[PDB]
Amino acid sequence: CGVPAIQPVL
Amino acid sequence: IVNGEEAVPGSWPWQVSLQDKTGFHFCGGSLINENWVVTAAHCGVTTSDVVVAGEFDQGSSSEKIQKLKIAKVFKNSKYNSLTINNDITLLKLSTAASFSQTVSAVCLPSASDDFAAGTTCVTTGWGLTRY
Amino acid sequence: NTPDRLQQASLPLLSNTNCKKYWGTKIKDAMICAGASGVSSCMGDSGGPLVCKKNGAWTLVGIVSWGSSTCSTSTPGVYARVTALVNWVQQTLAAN
């Protein structure tokens, strides 16, 4: 869990 | 979200959209596994509502989204609608979501998990961008 | 006033003590506040997440619950404190 395949950009 | 910014499509794979029968988005949700969604008790979700996963742009018709039926609604018995305390509802899905690059689960903390004041976190959704 | 595309926003967690300056007695043990930083959750955001990165993974710390009737970016948003409810979530998943 909690590890996106597409990385969020903040 | 007021003053937010548009996210990278599919970068918040657990974020779901609660929509009524008419296609109206009314609340957000988060996948915790393939068969369960956590949301707010006050959203007043029924079994006639739909869970929508893998969505980015609610305007587009070319995205490969998953429209998931709701099997059961589990409102926390501790939920006090008067005080809005313990505002949590579990949604058990009729068909399991299919995990992909754009649909996956968020992690749950332990009861002893500590999140200190001042910690920068992130919130997401399709709520009003302006009141 | 509703976005077609998914929005995001970075925000800081507050202490229940400090959030009581804004909401007073409305803040209970099972609540956690965040924001009051120039951003705000708003109508339609409810049920969604408040995640904090830890040991490399995104963790559900809160659930968009309630806040300012005008989505004022200078007043803290209230979220369901997941740590206080995780045991019930676990009892429910186990049993069903």
The CATH number assigned to the domain holding B96 equals 2.40.10.10
CA dist C55 and B4 (Å) reads 25
* Structural domain total, chain B: 1
**Contact call for C57 and A1, based on CB within 8 A:** yes
Give dist(CA C49, CA B111) in Å, integer: 17
Q: Residues B71, B59, C41, C49: is their CA dihedral positive or negative? A: positive
Instruction: List the chains bordering chain C where 3 or more Cβ pairs fall under 8 Å.
Output: A, B
Under 8 Å between Cβ of C58 and B31: no
Into how many domains does chain C fold?
1
Structure-token pair, residue B121: 């976190």
Q: What is the resolution of the experimental data for this entry, in Å?
A: 2.1
Chain B 99-118, residues with CB within 8 Å of chain A CB atoms: 100-102, 104-108
Catalytic residue among B20, B25, B42, B57: B42
Q: Give, in degrees to the nearest 5, the angle at Cα B35 between B54 and C95.
A: 160
Give the domain range for residue B42.
1-131
Query: Which CATH number does the domain housing residue C73 bear?
Result: 2.40.10.10
Question: Which residue bears the tokens 């709520």?
Answer: B127
Q: Which domain holds residue C56?
A: 1-96
Residues 6+ apart with CB under 8 A from B9: A6, B56, B57, B102, C6
Task: Note the Cα B91 to chain centre separation in Å.
Answer: 10
* Angular region, C92: left φ>0, alpha ψ -120 to 50, beta rest: alpha
> Which candidate from C8, C10, C58 shows the least CB-CB separation from A2?
C58
- The experimental method is X-ray
